UniProtKB/Swiss-Prot annotation, chain A:
Family indicated by similarity: Belongs to the DDB1 family.
Organism: Homo sapiens (Human)
UniProt-annotated stretches for the region Interaction with CDT1: 2-768
Free-text comment on this protein's domains from its UniProt entry: The core of the protein consists of three WD40 beta-propeller domains.
Lineage of producing organism: Eukaryota, Metazoa, Chordata, Craniata, Vertebrata
Name listed for the protein in its UniProt record: DNA damage-binding protein 1
UniProtKB/Swiss-Prot annotation, chain B:
Protein task: Protein, which is both involved in DNA repair and protein ubiquitination, as part of the UV-DDB complex and DCX (DDB1-CUL4-X-box) complexes, respectively. Core component of the UV-DDB complex (UV-damaged DNA-binding protein complex), a complex that recognizes UV-induced DNA damage and recruit proteins of the nucleotide excision repair pathway (the NER pathway) to initiate DNA repair. The UV-DDB complex preferentially binds to cyclobutane pyrimidine dimers (CPD), 6-4 photoproducts (6-4 PP), apurinic sites and short mismatches.
Family: Belongs to the WD repeat DDB2/WDR76 family.
Chief localization: nucleus
Record's protein name: DNA damage-binding protein 2
Any one biological process term the GO annotation gives: DNA damage response
């Protein structure tokens, strides 16, 4: 046992670099974004970006550069993976088939050597002669790119300058000429060399060297018309041409460091400078035409253009449009100005591309209708600081929406018989019916002749003999298409009101009290052909023709009022073909027959929102397999639409749902909406293949998502968001924020820019006196200048997430953990404080503070000073377990409401992460792998059970069950530990064996249980067992799942065959990509399966599909083995996608 | 000298919390966080000051091996021929093998990576045994054939399934773990003090000798008669040359007062030189510098010398811990009433416990 499944819900949203050029065409301007393992290719249109292809790579994209070799009609792509996979890639379109082809590829890693602290640097010769990389300190790697070299074989040059800050190839020199800032005991200097592929060594650049501004980080290669290099730092920008030196130190840089640059003008006239505060500067190179000896640089000037979101990189596109590649907040697309408007802004956000990263913490919550589940709330972080609310479902894209309250039903209509499409939408209210004529996208209240609007319509629609029908409460009206005229009218003989209706193309079944009349639609003729009475009142009706029925249904489905039954009647005669008892008391509210994948069903929904459904036999009217689902407390109204050729059912209630079948069992995709009362398909000229959806206040025309999707809401804080948790009782979230303030001339503090805790009506500051400060202000991080943390707790509501109450912590307390709890009284918010002084590396002064919130009043209840830094806390069997530093404390809460020191565990170095299950306690000790503790009652203390050997620098930790433990470490790997018991007094039961390895490629803060999909009892399938969701620093949020022993093998096998097919996007072997990697270790990876390989099964040709299934012995649950077909696996993978 | 002018650690004044959160946000290079942890460790190492468990056996300590997995199990070799398999934190009377006592010094011992109930040994009896701790041989991997020729120094690589032994004359034998000879060429002119094959590159062997050189070899490529890849010259005889975990960088410890780091991007010339007294004495096991298995640090026994140019005014029989990029004293470990010259010092697999062969004694340094 111990088999695991990793599948990407979401996908990294952070930009790790973006490059511009002519990849797709040549006439095209392309933008290429790297997400992590994802490559997104775009074309720049007059108005924005047009997405052509997104590719996934078996690697973390480290270098992504476009280059044009001589004799190539377009730019090629060069990619380097962080696992050192290099490749040249080419865009190819086979008429309609998009293909990225691997021109050259290889693993360029040395067979030894430690990566530089500054990371991989890749640069391409301005003449595409060669590729130069800095992988390790004191070596320069050169790939001879020139001429045919297809395995990307590469040599190394010794680089006496050990500590390289930044390299770039210079423009316009008689040899490949490399320029770099380095660091030695003397400071930082710029030096240059020449690279000769010929002799394989440096030779010496166009100038010996220069001293460089103390903190010089960037090296910009300036193009032909100038040809120098720009060197950026803090407080200074310099130009070096080689003999020519010119520098400036504009005051408006001293606020934050310059992270990124980008050339605006092909000649190199202007450059864009992204900040760290999230500023945007224009760099201007002063052209001075001299007289003969022609263009010379006069000066440098910089001008603030305004504020973007915090940029990891940027590229200007054209027409003053810029793409902002952000990793800390939402990436964006912006317009620049010639003349700045109000508040001196040349910058305006055009499009905001949402990004979840980093995600410091997250929790799972059941908010919408409480029926499982399903939403995740996460994080942030800086001024980009935000709360993201993410939930799973089928989204609707609104194209029109009218404030039109109290709709009581909707019907599409073709007024024009010559027209294919709908042109009229009819709605009914309590009072009456209104008619909406659809012109363009324009709706229009008219009337059609023959339709009354005195009272409510129960049904209307196109009908048999080129006619319209309107079944009102009062009557049944039959209108003629050509000359719109009432052509026949049926009323209940004794002038009574219709109480229930139903209608297909040629048959009608109305109901009065108990009575039922079956009418038929003929030219000009509403011919009544049958009249019965029912045992009790008629609740609802359906006469939908099923399958080979000539629009003429042999059956009639009906729900009854007091006996609460859903019975099938033989239509012609009303011969009761099958009665079915449902439940007690609650009156059935909607009934419908329908065909799913050529199998026939009878669905039936009640006034409490409970839906039954049966397998209806068309012949015998036989119902079988009574299955029952609850879906929201509103009486669920049923309806139909057509998804492809396939036909689904919309379940209109407070918790709207769309039902369809996949194999022969039916699936409930949750619709991403507030209430929906009624609904109908509208295929208008102006609204093609759309839906009319009415809630209590609003008509809506729109388009429905093809498949269940995954969907996000932003709540901006302008603060770093840190930790979060949900206090379900006080209908409230609690968030630990923290804001940068600048140390003042006097006492420090003072924020820049208002944030969630500054805009805070009802806010507090505990001035708890338990600490004693130094007599002389020990101001470090500048004794009067630079920044300070400042950390408070905040309260977000629930729905609406207005910020209720803000509370400033100890003033120097960093505060690292958050909790919603009980031990006897009320539900408290407990905060584990840090107490960081600039200034000392080790923290040695905790504080656990207990809070009680209500009515915007947030009250410091209890308190306990600790002698360390409370790294995490957990509600544990009624007690509050806490890691302090090396120590793991238990803490108890007695009357007098104080937190009182129970038993301890001492043997740890860091102890940053805690996770309990029952009486078991998982401990991520940062400085030495992970350990299992038990609280033993009958006993009252801690007992080490098992330690993992091999020392993992874990990112976060998680329990999967009392035997398996999940870790993610700084290596972007995952590991799984194991319990046991071993014979004869000696315990390897004390050894937490580690039994699963997997290179994720992401960095995991927070795991947590819960899911985004609703889970089904008896049916569905159990290749899924657990559900643990996890947050990435790139905003990718995968889930892990417990697999069957049987299942694991099948999928393990699948992978290998899938691997034989699937053109890898740089001939990177998948098994390698996944195989567990450290700077010291590399191992195959076991116990895990990536759904991302499994799911990419649904994306290949049916031949290649059959190739993978060839020779496969498959168990379909029958136990009797059979040859597997391509379809057996499609409905297996199909299922597995429906688990996130 | 400096492996890039300091791996300077993260955010203003670098409080670990500040550094850890930075790492969390994506804003912090792992190598930076690393350094922060390293500092955090270096601090705990000052309270390591406690020897929590001491022991002897007899004669003198000559070989130290940490059990590859258990962070409590330690093997110790003796000039006599003694082997102690000691799991401290168990109080269970260490498994013991008594040796010859006459010759029979254990000049080297590594645990059998493929089976930790067994160990390998470089014996002054002239044999490299593969032997069970329950004192019984399985196969003598090499025996001398002339008296006065014995072996001094082992390694052994689970991964490539190799065994290398250096004899006291300069010969190096290379064996596969079945016992078949692939080597024998006299790689060095005098006693081969230390043999160590690269943790990250199966076939990349470093051999250090009394001939005042360290040699670097390729086994799969250059079997062809005593014609290595690099030979590093030293001021004196070399006591030990062992690789950093990860295989880049080699830690050379000479016989008098010089320790060297050699980078993988070079090998040929030294990255830095750390001056540090360790001298030769009569009944003293040669001092050897070692890496900390996890952080970038160096451990050594200091052996005060009135002639060595001391930088510090206070020169005791301390356990020295050097940076390893800076090359500069990160702290000293010293227990009056227990300290003497600490020949050997190795950290755990986990690097949270320090085993010290203190000439005659075995010391276990741990945090309170």
């Amino acid at each position: 046992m111990s088999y695991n499944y990793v599948v990407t819900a979401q996908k990294p949203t952070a930009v790790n670099g973006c490059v511009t050029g002519h990849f797709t065409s040549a006439e095209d301007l392309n933008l290429l974004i790297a997400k992590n393992t994802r490559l997104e290719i775009y074309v720049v249109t007059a108005e924005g970006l047009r997405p052509v292809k997104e590719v996934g790579m078996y690697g973390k994209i480290a270098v992504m550069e476009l280059f044009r070799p001589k004799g190539e009609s377009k730019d090629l792509l060069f990619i380097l993976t962080a696992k050192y996979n290099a490749c040249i890639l080419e865009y190819k379109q086979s008429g309609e088939s998009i293909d990225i082809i691997t021109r050259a590829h290889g693993n360029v890693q040395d067979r030894i050597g430690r990566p530089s602290e500054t990371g991989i640097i890749g640069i391409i010769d301005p003449e595409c002669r060669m590729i130069g990389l800095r992988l390790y300190d004191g070596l320069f790697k050169v790939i001879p790119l020139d001429r045919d070299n297809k395995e990307l074989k590469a040599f190394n040059i010794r680089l006496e300058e050990l500590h390289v800050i930044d390299v770039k190839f210079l423009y316009g020199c008689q040899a490949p000429t490399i320029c770099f800032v380095y660091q030695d005991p003397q400071g930082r200097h710029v030096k240059t060399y020449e690279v000769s592929l010929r002799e394989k060594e440096f030779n010496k650049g166009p100038w010996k060297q220069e001293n460089v501004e103390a903190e010089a980080s960037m090296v910009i290669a300036v193009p032909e018309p100038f040809g120098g290099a720009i060197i950026i730092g803090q407080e200074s920008i310099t130009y070096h041409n080689g003999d020519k030196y010119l520098a400036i130190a504009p005051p408006i840089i001293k606020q934050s460091t310059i992270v990124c640059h980008n050339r605006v003008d092909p000649n190199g006239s202007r450059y864009l400078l992204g900040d760290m505060e999230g500023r945007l500067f224009m760099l201007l190179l002063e052209k001075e035409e001299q007289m003969d000896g022609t263009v010379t640089l006069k000066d440098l000037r910089v001008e603030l253009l305004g504020e973007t979101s915090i940029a990891e990189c940027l590229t200007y596109l054209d027409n003053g449009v810029v793409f902002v590649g952000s990793r800390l907040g939402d990436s964006q697309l912006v317009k620049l100005n010639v003349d700045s408007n109000e508040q001196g802004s040349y910058v305006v956000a055009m499009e905001t591309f949402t990004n979840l990263g980093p995600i410091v913490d997250m929790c799972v919550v059941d908010l919408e209708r409480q029926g499982q589940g399903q939403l995740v709330t996460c994080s942030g972080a800086f001024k980009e600081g935000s709360l993201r609310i993410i939930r799973n479902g089928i989204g609707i894209h609104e194209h029109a929406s009218i404030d039109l309250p109290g709709i009581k039903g909707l019907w599409p209509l073709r007024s024009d018989p010559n027209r294919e499409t709908y042109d009229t939408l009819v709605l009914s209210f309590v009072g009456q019916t209104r008619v909406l004529m659809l012109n363009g996208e324009e709706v229009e209240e008219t009337e059609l002749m023959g339709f009354v609007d005195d009272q409510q319509t129960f049904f209307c629609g196109n009908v048999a003999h080129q006619q319209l029908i309107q079944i009102t409460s009062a009557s049944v009206r039959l209108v003629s298409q050509e000359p719109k005229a009432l052509v026949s009218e049926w009323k209940e003989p004794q002038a009574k009101n219709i109480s229930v209706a139903s209608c297909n193309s040629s048959q009608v079944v109305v109901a009065v009290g108990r009575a039922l009349y079956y009418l038929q639609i003929h030219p000009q003729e509403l011919r009544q052909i049958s009249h019965t009475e029912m045992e009790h009142e008629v609740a609802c009706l359906d006469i939908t023709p099923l399958g080979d029925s000539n629009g003429l249904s042999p059956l009639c489905a009906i729900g009854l009022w007091t006996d609460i039954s859903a019975r099938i009647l033989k239509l012609p005669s009303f011969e009761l073909l099958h009665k079915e008892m449902l439940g007690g008391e609650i009156i059935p509210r909607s009934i419908l027959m329908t065909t799913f994948e050529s199998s026939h069903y009878l669905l039936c929904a009640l006034g409490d929102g409970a839906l039954f459904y049966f397998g209806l036999n068309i012949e015998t009217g036989l119902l079988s397999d009574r299955k029952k689902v609850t879906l929201g407390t509103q009486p669920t109204v049923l309806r139909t639409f057509r998804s492809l050729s396939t036909t689904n059912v919309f379940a209109c209630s407070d918790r709207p749902t769309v039902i369809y079948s996949s194999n022969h069992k039916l699936v409930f995709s949750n619709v991403n909406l507030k209430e929906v009362n009624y609904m109908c398909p509208l295929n208008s000229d102006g609204y093609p293949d759309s839906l009319a959806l009415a809630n209590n206040s609003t008509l809506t025309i729109g388009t429905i998502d093809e498949i269940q999707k995954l969907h996000i809401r932003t709540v901006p804080l302008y603060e770093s968001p840190r930790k979060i948790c949900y206090q379900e009782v006080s209908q409230c979230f609690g968030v630990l924020s923290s804001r940068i303030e600048v140390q003042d001339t006097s006492g420090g503090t003072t924020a820049l820019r208002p944030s969630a805790s500054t805009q805070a009506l009802s806010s507090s500051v505990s001035s708890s006196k338990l600490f004693s400060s130094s007599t002389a202000p020990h101001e470090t991080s500048f004794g009067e200048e630079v920044e300070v943390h400042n950390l408070l707790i905040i309260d977000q509501h629930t729905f609406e997430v207005l910020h209720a109450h803000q509370f400033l912590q100890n003033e120097y307390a960093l505060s690292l953990v958050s909790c919603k709890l009980g031990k006897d009284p009320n539900t408290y918010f407990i905060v584990g404080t840090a107490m960081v002084y600039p200034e000392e590396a080790e923290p040695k002064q905790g504080r656990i503070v207990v809070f009680q919130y209500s009515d915007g009043k947030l009250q410091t209840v209890a308190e306990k000073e600790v002698k360390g830094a409370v790294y995490s806390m957990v509600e544990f069997n009624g007690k509050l377990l806490a890691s302090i530093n090396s120590t793991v404390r238990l803490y108890e809460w007695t009357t007098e409401k104080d937190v009182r020191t129970e038993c301890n565990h001492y043997n740890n170095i860091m102890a940053l992460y805690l996770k309990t299950k029952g009486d078991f306690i998982l401990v991520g000790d940062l400085m030495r792998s992970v350990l299992l503790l038990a609280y033993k009652p009958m006993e009252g203390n801690f007992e080490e059970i098992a330690r993992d050997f091999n020392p993992n620098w874990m990112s976060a930790v998680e329990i999967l069950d009392d035997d398996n433990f999940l870790g993610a470490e700084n290596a972007f790997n995952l590991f799984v530990c194991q319990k046991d018991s071993a014979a004869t007094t000696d315990e390897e039961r004390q050894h937490l064996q580690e039994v699963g390895l997997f290179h994720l490629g992401e960095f995991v803060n927070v795991f947590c249980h819960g899911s985004l999909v609703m889970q089904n009892l008896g049916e569905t399938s159990t290749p899924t067992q657990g559900s643990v969701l996890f947050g990435t620093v790139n905003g990718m949020i995968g889930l892990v799942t417990s697999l069957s022993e049987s299942w694991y093998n099948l999928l393990l096998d699948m992978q290998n065959r899938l691997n034989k097919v699937i053109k890898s996007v740089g001939k990177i072997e998948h098994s390698f990509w996944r195989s567990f990697h450290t700077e010291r270790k590399t191992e195959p990876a076991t116990g895990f399966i990536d759904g991302d390989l499994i799911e990419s099964f649904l994306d290949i040709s049916r031949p290649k599909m059959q190739e993978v299934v060839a020779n496969l012995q498959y168990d379909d649950g029958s136990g009797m083995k059979r040859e597997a077909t391509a379809d057996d696996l499609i409905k297996v993978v199909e299922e597995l996608t429906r688990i996130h | 000298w400096v492996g890039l002018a300091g791996p300077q650690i993260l955010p203003p004044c670098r409080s670990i919390v500040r550094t850890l959160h930075q790492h969390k946000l994506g804003r912090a290079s792992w190598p930076s966080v690393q350094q922060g942890l390293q500092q955090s460790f270096l601090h705990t190492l000052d309270s390591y000051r406690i020897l929590q468990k001491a022991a002897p056996f007899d004669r003198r300590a000559t070989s130290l091996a940490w059990h590859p997995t258990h962070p409590s199990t330690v093997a110790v070799g003796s000039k006599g021929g003694d082997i102690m398999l000691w799991n401290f934190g168990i109080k269970d009377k260490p498994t013991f093998i008594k040796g010859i006592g006459a010759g029979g010094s254990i000049t080297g011992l590594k645990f059998n990576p493929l089976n930790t109930n067994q160990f390998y040994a470089s014996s002054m009896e002239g044999t490299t045994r593969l032997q069970d701790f329950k004192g019984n041989i399985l196969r003598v991997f090499a025996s001398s054939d002339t008296i006065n020729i014995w072996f001094c120094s082992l390694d052994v690589s689970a991964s490539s399934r190799m065994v290398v032994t250096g004899d006291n004359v300069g010969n190096v034998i290379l064996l596969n773990m079945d016992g078949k000879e692939l080597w024998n060429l006299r790689m060095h002119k005098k006693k081969v003090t230390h043999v160590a094959l690269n943790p990250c590159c199966d076939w990349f062997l470093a051999t250090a000798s009394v001939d005042q050189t360290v040699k670097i070899w390729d086994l799969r490529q250059v079997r062809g008669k005593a014609s290595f890849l690099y030979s590093l010259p030293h001021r004196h005889p070399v006591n030990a040359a062992c690789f950093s975990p990860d295989g880049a960088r080699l830690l050379t410890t000479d016989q008098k007062s010089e320790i060297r780091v050699y980078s993988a991007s070079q090998w040929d010339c030294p990255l830095g030189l750390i001056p540090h007294p360790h001298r030769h004495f009569q009944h003293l096991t040669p001092i050897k510098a070692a890496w900390h298995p996890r952080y970038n640090l160096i451990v050594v026994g200091r052996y005060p010398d009135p002639n060595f140019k001391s930088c510090t005014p206070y020169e005791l029989r301390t356990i020295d811990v050097f940076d390893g990029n800076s090359g500069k004293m990160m702290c000293q470990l010293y227990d009056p009433e227990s300290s003497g010259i600490s020949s050997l010092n190795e950290f755990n697999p986990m690097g949270d416990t320090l085993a010290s062969a203190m000439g005659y004694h075995i010391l276990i340094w741990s945090q309170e």
